Amino acid sequence: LGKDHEILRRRIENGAKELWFFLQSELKKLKNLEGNELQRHADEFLLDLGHHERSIMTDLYYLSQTDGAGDWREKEAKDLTELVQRRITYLQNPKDCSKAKKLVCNINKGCGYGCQLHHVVYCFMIAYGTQRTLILESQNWRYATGGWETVFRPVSETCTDRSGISTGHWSGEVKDKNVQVVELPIVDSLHPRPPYLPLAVPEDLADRLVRVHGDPAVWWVSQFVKYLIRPQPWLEKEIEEATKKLGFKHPVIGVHVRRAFHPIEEYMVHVEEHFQLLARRMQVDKKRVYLATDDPSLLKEAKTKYPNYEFISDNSISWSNSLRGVILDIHFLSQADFLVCTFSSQVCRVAYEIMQTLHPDASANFHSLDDIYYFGGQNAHNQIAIYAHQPRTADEIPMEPGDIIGVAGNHWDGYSKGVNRKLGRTGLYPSYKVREKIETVKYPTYPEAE
Amino acid sequence: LGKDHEILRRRIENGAKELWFFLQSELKKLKNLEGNELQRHADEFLLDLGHHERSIMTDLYYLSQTDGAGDWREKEAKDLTELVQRRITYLQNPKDCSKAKKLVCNINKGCGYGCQLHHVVYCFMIAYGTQRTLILESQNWRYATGGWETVFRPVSETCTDRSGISTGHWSGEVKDKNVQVVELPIVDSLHPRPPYLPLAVPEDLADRLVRVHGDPAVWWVSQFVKYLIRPQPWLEKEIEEATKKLGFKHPVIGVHVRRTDKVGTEAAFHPIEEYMVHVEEHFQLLARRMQVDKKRVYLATDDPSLLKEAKTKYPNYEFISDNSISWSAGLHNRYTENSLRGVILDIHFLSQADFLVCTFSSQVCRVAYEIMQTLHPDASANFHSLDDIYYFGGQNAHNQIAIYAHQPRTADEIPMEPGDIIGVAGNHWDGYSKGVNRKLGRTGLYPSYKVREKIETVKYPTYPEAE
Ligand SMILES: Nc1nc2c(ncn2[C@@H]2O[C@H](COP(=O)(O)OP(=O)(O)O)[C@@H](O)[C@H]2O)c(=O)[nH]1
Secondary structure (H helix, E strand, O other), X not given: OOXXXXXXXXXXXXXXXXXXXHHHHHHHHHOOOOHHHHHHHHHHHHHHHHHHHHHHHHXXXXXXXXXXXXXXHHHHXXXXXXXXXXXXXXXXXXXXXXXXXXXXXXXXXXXXXXXXXXXXXXXHHHHHHXXXXXXXXXXXXXXXXXXXXXXXXXXXXXXXOOOOOOEEEOOOOOOOOOOOEEEOOOHHHOOOOOOOOOOOEEHHHHHHHHHHOOOHHHHHHHHHHHHHOOEOHHHHHHHHHHHHHHOOOOOEEEEEEXXXXXXXXXXXXXXXXXXXXXXXXOOOOOEEEEEEEOOOOHHHHHHHHOOOEEEEOOOOOOOOOHHHHHHHHHHHXXXXXXXXXXXXXXXXHHHHHHHHOOOOOOOOOEEEOOOOOOOOOOOOOEEEEOOOEOOOOOOEXXXXXXXXXXXEEEOOOOEEEEEEOOOOEEEEEEHHHEEEOOOEEOOOOOHHHO | OOHHHHHHHHHHHHHHHHHHHHHHHHHHHHOOOOHHHHHHHHHHHHHHHHHHHHHHHHHHHHHHHOOOHHHHHHHHHHHHHHHHHHHHHHHHOOOOHHHOOEEEEEOOOOOOHHHHHHHHHHHHHHHHHHOOEEEEEOOOEOOEOOOHHHOEOOOOOOOOOOOOOOEEEOOOOOXXXXXXXXXXXXXXXXXXXXXXXXXXXEHHHHHHHHHHOOOHHHHHHHXXXXXXXXXXXXXXXXXXHHHHHHOOOOOEEEEEEOOHHHEOOOEOOOOHHHHHHHHHHHHHHHHHHOOOOOEEEEEEEOOOOHHHHHHHHOOOEXXXXXXXXXXXXXXXXXXXXXXXXXXXXXXXXXXXXXXEEEXXXXXXXXHHHHHHHOOOOOOOOOEEEOOOOOOOOOOOOOEEEEOOOEOOOOOXXXXXXXXXXXXXXXXXXXXXXXXXXXXXXXXXEEEHHHEEEOXXXXXOOOOHHHO
8 A cells, every 4th residue: 555655644634634623613613703803813713724724735745646656647647748749740740741631720810829829729639630730821920920930840840731632621520531631710610610629638548647637638738739839949048048047946936917907916825825835845945936927017016015025027128029028938837836827818828738748747736816727619618516515595506416517617715606507507506516527539549650 | 546546636635625715715704794694604604614524534535445445454454463363362372381471460450341351451461562371360350250251252272270380470571581470460550561551562563553554552452352352152142142133233323421430530421412413423424425224323321311312312313222231330230240241242332333432531432442443444533532532541651743833822832843742631622632742841732733643662572483
């Protein structure tokens, strides 16, 4: 079993049991207070609970590493990504470009960099699913006159032209089985939708992925992000020089403030709380925050309000134009130990996706002030109720074990919101009473890549 | 790495994180309420928290069993107990009793059955530690004139006579090395004390025991209880027949309500409701993972009127109890073979239950809890005590080690730094324990989660010839 594994499991269990003893006793006392005394005691109660809750979280972290688990998870995550990158690379580099099935993707969607990048990711996932080589059209790119390849590696070494014996607009994989070159539109108008879309995961990888990673959907998205953003040597060098110039070092928490309005304190409470967690398992000499924002006055405000934090930020005037800022910001957010921001932002999502490629399982190393993780155009995100729920208020929905719940969001207060598809009712339910429903799709497995 | 293990670990982690989201949000709302509305919301809050906390505990239970862990823990616990029983049996059965080193123990300490049995255990552990065959003197035992063997097997198949070429009172292992027969008195005045006492565990078993079991000290005590209470054939048949006549079936929770002479002197009176709160909560835990058709309680008590009171107050529970045994425990009748049979049976069924609610100040409940350790791989946490933590009368000081610093909020609390040795007096079951910080010489309250147990070890003989 492992002595440390057993010691830690029992200490998590006893720690939670002592938490419950404490909760019952203190809540019973809180019932008899009022006014200011009630607030004093409730606030002390909260402070005590936080440290206690973090000791449980710290033991759970140690449990995840103990008795070789950390090393095994790292090796397996490495094997999985090398497997997928090998398949993508095999698909992308046919020997005869003239006879390859192709899918043509135009990068120049009318939106920002993160949205354009996710459009290429969506093209790539469908190309992978249909066994078509992705051809990326990037001329007249707003972010770089020379196009994609002046900044990132070409998505193929052997096949970058869209020539073929037959060309057509996407009409479905079977309908298109004999069209060599298929042009794919933006996801918003895609008809018919193939199954090769988030949040599903390939069947042949699903079992291994669940063993390794807490959100396989994001891991799967991130393999395509990883391949796409292979940087040219000069950009790799620029990122290296910025790291030294900015003093970007660990531990560091990334904060992306996109401008509902959220005040800086709403981000920073989660920053501080995560640094308290980290201090239980490592020495934190300086609390470093990488701040990405489109508000030029926010940086000054953060430094003044949090003088014990070192705020690192990118105020690049030139390279050593907006493309420079977004690349550096996404890079440093993705490299942080924890990410605080609103997943409604594509930039925040991109950083979180890239972060998955830097650790065996970074799925939980974020806090979003609004949305849960999603991919624009994804199929319905469903959960499965595991425990019954009886609504206490009219804003809550009932659940029985097995009910399919279409989740709209997590309110980060103990409750989530969604629709109970068995009942046709929408409302609030306790977040702990459902589990994620991992969707799978039969993808090609490209055995020839091995 | 096993898939279920990973799924469960993550759900425990996410379950706790959601618990913390819920705590912060709901406490913020409670701060703005007062009076009756505050009391209603607090009570709903408590109800919601209980189900949520039990989901976390249920996932932790599954984690302990998953991916072969349950099978492995069961086999290793079985290998450990077979090893120790084999060593004890080897010690207890020398080839020539007339040439064997012996330790003589008299069962008739001036106290009740559990205290007397624990005296024999203390004798036995010292005999095992000193490589002396235990000789149990039990004639004129207050519970049975005919002695231990009227109910239990003799503690040896080959060596029950106390004779030898030399006999002496205990004076220590080195001094007594050439005394064939050593007489051991009660623990209260033993000098010099040997190290073979609770709560320490043998060095040679400590690592394996920490791997399998949440309280090795009790497991070690329980091996000697297990050997001692091997039943005579007639008692074995009686226990089997009582099991069938009582309808004793699982799941069942054992409740020992000790009253009579215990109250005031060594413990307090506790009303039935204080026991049943913990019974009800544990059945709520069990219903998470199994079907509970009937909520069964095995009630052992020295109060004969309690059974009817309990049935009336808890009409949806099935109370399994022998009310003639409760009467047999009355003070005037207590030291009789009738009463002995009753307390052996009550302790047996308590020990067989899936969970135990009692007052550990009573030796009866501690015996049941010790026996329970021999029936499961790790039953160390399957109790709730209304007063004391587990202890063994005569043990060496029970110490803990602070793992997280504590800064006192009230005058009743003690400070702690990591590494401080804390002498625990008790757990108040409210988040705080009480003890002395030995570094500071200060006594008071500290958060129970901020210490770990200090497992003590002693070099014992290993009887390699027993293999
Ligand atoms: N059968 C039975 N006898 C009991 C019960 N409670 C107390 N007694 C009797 O009272 C004695 C109490 O002495 P002891 O075992 O040393 O435990 P303590 O006095 O409770 O710490 C027991 O040994 C029994 O003889 C009970 O629940 N059932």
